[PDB]
Subunit: 61 residues, 4 copies
């Protein structure tokens, strides 16, 4: 019924799949790197403290 | 022909594959937890209403 | 080893992982919505044209 | 037990699940595109130096 060319056809694209998964973590990684450098840039300071800004985000959105 | 070692292989990576997935929603929920943090950081401000601001630039980009 | 139960395990988890994937596409579109807003938000205006600054940083990084 | 059909669903939704993984890469490459513009556009200069705000961000952030 089955055929060695079938079990392999699966196990084949099977390894290729995992690949995309690990390559993924490599992408989402570069992202957070960006989201991170950002928070640092807009991290207000002096004259205004992120806390005061939150105070405006605590009363009402 | 087919060999119990080959079905087990694909089934082995299978379990590992799911792992990456769940650990994916984890790093994902983080990417947003940050993105939102920055958004809710500025938030609408009297005088510097982030909302009103956006409008001003929506009239003529 | 070869037992319709083992291939069914790979197929059953398949639909499960699939769901997570499509759903992921949903959380992805979100990352953009939060991005376009984060961009159209800080987009400075009146005083410093996002173009003038952007260009200035173009001459050199 | 072994049904060349039950495999077809598997080996078929297989080549499919793939087209998804690479698809998500399409949305991902999209995110970065906006992620970059976001940072590259807010790159503040003259008055506030990201280098300074980066120094405080190096203290422990």
């Amino acid at each position: 019924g089955p055929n060695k060319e079938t079990i392999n056809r699966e196990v084949s694209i099977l390894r290729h799949s995992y690949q995309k998964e690990i390559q993924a973590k490599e992408t989402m990684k570069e992202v957070l790197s960006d989201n991170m450098e950002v928070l640092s840039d807009h991290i207000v300071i002096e004259g205004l403290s992120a806390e005061e800004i939150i105070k405006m985000g605590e009363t009402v959105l």
